[PDB]
Swiss-Prot record, chain B:
ATP binds at residues 41-46, 68, 118-125, 168-169. Residues 271-309 form a coiled coil. Homodimer. Forms a heterotrimer with a catalytic subunit par-1/pan2 to form the poly(A)-nuclease (PAN) deadenylation complex. Interacts (via PAM-2 motif) with poly(A)-binding protein pabp-1 (via PABC domain), conferring substrate specificity of the enzyme complex. GO terms for biological process: mRNA processing; nuclear-transcribed mRNA poly(A) tail shortening. The lineage of its organism: Eukaryota, Fungi, Dikarya, Ascomycota, Pezizomycotina. Residues 310-392 are annotated as: Knob domain. Transmembrane segments: none annotated. Residues 17-270 are annotated as: Pseudokinase domain. Belongs to the protein kinase superfamily. PAN3 family. Keywords: ATP-binding, Coiled coil, Cytoplasm, Metal-binding, mRNA processing, Nucleotide-binding, Zinc, Zinc-finger. This is PAN2-PAN3 deadenylation complex subunit pan3. GO terms for cellular component: P-body; PAN complex. It comes from Neurospora crassa (strain ATCC 24698 / 74-OR23-1A / CBS 708.71 / DSM 1257 / FGSC 987). The N-terminal zinc finger binds to poly(A) RNA. Contains a pseudokinase domain. The protein kinase domain is predicted to be catalytically inactive because some of the residues important for catalytic activity are substituted and it lacks the equivalent of the binding site for a peptide substrate. However, it has retained an ATP-binding site and ATP-binding is required for mRNA degradation, stimulating the activity of the PAN2 nuclease in vitro. GO terms for molecular function: ATP binding; poly(A) binding; zinc ion binding.
Length: 387, 392
């Protein structure tokens, strides 16, 4: 479908996107740096330092990656990078943006620390997404968020680690898929036990969901119980119950763990697993249909290698003119992308439909089907492979 | 990849796939019936009647569906088909082959009852897959447990039961399993003495659940009543203790003080549902990269469309596009023989599509002149020339 296709068109387009007038310094291992930031203002609330986001191409493999730059940071200990990235690089999770390495650079005309993450096109912060630069969220979507975050914490926690940074602005959204996008950063900048940090995780978890449910971006100390009571008419009591459990501190004799929360999740984990599957299935049928592009592109390779290098190949020449050199009555071009598309669709299927191939010298004209032409193309292409 | 390319084409070929000499009769709304039974033998153990499987194309929408034929069933009551399919038609679940309708027909030269299901290409029965005509990994077994649990959850919350729960009636396709005989016994037992309650029937599901997994785990197709506890102690060394505990919980009838529900099983599974959920998600992501690649192919094809339109329509700035085409596809070796290289073709057009800043050398027909040019420059010459033809 169209929305799915235009989403994919927007993803591929974001990756190629550049800014011809931009002046950002090329790194030793990176080039084509592109800004990901959506506003012109930066605060040090999130990191303790100003932050910049960029899309860049790797010089060695050419793939695109995301770089989070921390402004005004000087390395005072090579252990702070090495003792953190050694643990976080290993963590691979569908709801955590994977980090690869961390290094300092001086190319920004200052001292910056640079983290590399997987680049996810069209990702926008969960904050900006539910609170635009200027109603209520379905409960199902809220449960989608809880399950995804639960999946992440289970894995982080299975590594004797903690998220530390768990906020609306550091979780990326892309078609209802959310990921933790600031991992391993506070781990480095700070050099306090992991368990208490793990407990704060549950707390930060709760405020994020609570914020979305009550439609309030900024969160205060005073309404952890007030805003908790605004959700009972709009949402189920089960929802309010989970939020209450994550956010409230005590857990007096047996402290909060992810494994205990899961039974709390229950059907939504099963339901959720069902949803991702319905989605993986829908992509499967959508994939098979696109396979034609590969079949069509591969046909164009063959036709172009053969053309213009005589014989049976004359028809193939006459065929290209038929597909692409069509003109209107005044001599004006009859550009029709659909025509290009439909000829090749028919060529790929070895369609039995017939066409008229007039030579430049009009004395001879060939009546032929797409099937025959298709068989002719592979033939000529195969004879070039013999030598 | 080779496997990814080959698996998906095998799906599309199977949906369209034919057998001309079959002699099979078109129904009131269906045509082009293609047989799916892979074996030459039929027993009436599963349904009580011989069964036949077909793929058929719908007369109205042209889409393919699977039809399970029950040979020799005479309709004695319409309430049997309405009362059942109205509840099951409502259920949409990824581990359940969705059922649409049920009707009788006489086109087979007899009395047949027909169920229509969604058609899932390249599907094979869980039985034939693991027991064809060394250990099954534990990860895969939990995947089956999670999927079946997912199905039972949806079924049970609909005040229904699986009824049909066997290896031969579950289809496997790339580690994805689905129940493929649902709503049938609902019909075939719709009219019989001593009916069990949906509550009692729901309990049998759990028992059949355990036996299926147990069967895969003990790698014994045939399972007997005497080894429900015997075959159960062989898996603690091969498999984890959690797994044995769950099978025991599912299979044993007793439900000693309370009877078993899926909601209770779910909490028993715990991390394995997350593991599974995490896995399906990553696999769904990989399809996204393959998807984008194919969409990319569309962009490459659209570039060559433009390029083919311009070429042989020249000199000037279009002479370079002509020379670019020679550069990409008319490459020859030192001997003079053609140098076919799809990779060369591929990487050139990728660079053309990205408006790469990389430069390449374009030699003219006459070996005297060579153009130092970038893909970006080539790209801008290409789009500029293509736009100027729509202007006239
Ligand atoms: N792995 C990633 N892949 C792609 N885009 C990403 C990735 N991680 C982050 N982003 C993008 O980078 C941005 C990071 O968020 P920020 O720009 O720091 O939020 P912000 O609030 O606008 O800026 P502040 O206030 O200075 S933290 C998001 O808008 C995402 O779109
Ligand atoms: N809903 C379905 N969609 C696609 N293929 C299906 C479906 N249901 C069953 N099949 C295929 O049916 C084939 C065999 O059908 P079955 O009736 O389940 O087994 P069988 O051994 O051929 O027949 P009997 O009578 O049980 S011995 C399997 O290889 C499956 O791929």
């Amino acid at each position: 479908p169209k929305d799915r296709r235009e989403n994919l068109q927007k993803k591929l387009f974001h990756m190629q996107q550049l800014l011809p007038n931009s002046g950002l310094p090329n790194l030793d291992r990176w080039h084509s740096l592109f800004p990901l930031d959506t506003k012109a203002t930066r605060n040090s609330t999130c990191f303790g330092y100003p932050s910049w986001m960029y899309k860049a191409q790797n010089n060695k493999n050419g793939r695109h990656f995301a770089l989070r730059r921390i402004e005004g940071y000087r390395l005072t200990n090579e252990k702070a990078i090495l003792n953190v990235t050694k643990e976080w690089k290993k963590i691979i999770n569908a709801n955590i943006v994977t980090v690869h390495e961390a290094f300092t650079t001086e190319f920004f005309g200052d001292s910056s620390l640079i983290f590399v993450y997987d680049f996810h096109p069209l990702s926008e912060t969960l904050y900006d997404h539910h609170f635009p630069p200027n109603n209520k969220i379905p409960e199902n979507l809220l449960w989608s968020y809880v399950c995804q975050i639960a999946n992440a914490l289970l894995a982080i926690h299975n590594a004797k680690l903690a998220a530390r940074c768990l906020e609306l602005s550091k979780i990326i959204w892309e078609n209802n898929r959310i990921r933790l996008a600031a991992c391993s950063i506070l781990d480095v900048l700070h050099h306090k036990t992991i368990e208490e940090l793990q407990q704060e995780d549950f707390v930060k978890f709760g405020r994020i969901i609570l914020a979305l449910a009550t439609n309030t971006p900024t969160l205060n100390f005073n309404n952890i119980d007030a805003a908790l009571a605004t959700i009972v008419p709009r949402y189920s009591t089960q929802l309010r119950g989970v939020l209450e459990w994550l956010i409230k501190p005590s857990a007096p004799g047996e402290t909060k763990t992810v494994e205990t929360l899961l039974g709390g999740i229950t059907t939504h984990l099963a339901n959720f697993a069902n949803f991702v599957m319905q989605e993986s299935d829908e992509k499967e049928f959508h994939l098979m249909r696109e396979l034609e592009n590969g079949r069509i592109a591969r046909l164009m390779f063959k036709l172009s290698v053969v053309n213009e290098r005589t014989g049976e190949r004359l028809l193939l020449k006459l065929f290209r003119d038929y597909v692409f050199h069509q003109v209107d009555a005044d001599g004006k071009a009859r550009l029709d992308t659909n025509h290009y598309l439909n000829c090749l669709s028919k060529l790929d299927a070895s369609s039995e439909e017939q066409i008229l191939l007039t030579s430049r010298d009009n004395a001879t004209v060939f009546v032929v089907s797409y099937r025959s032409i298709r068989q002719m193309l592979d033939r000529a292409y195969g004879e070039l492979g013999k030598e």
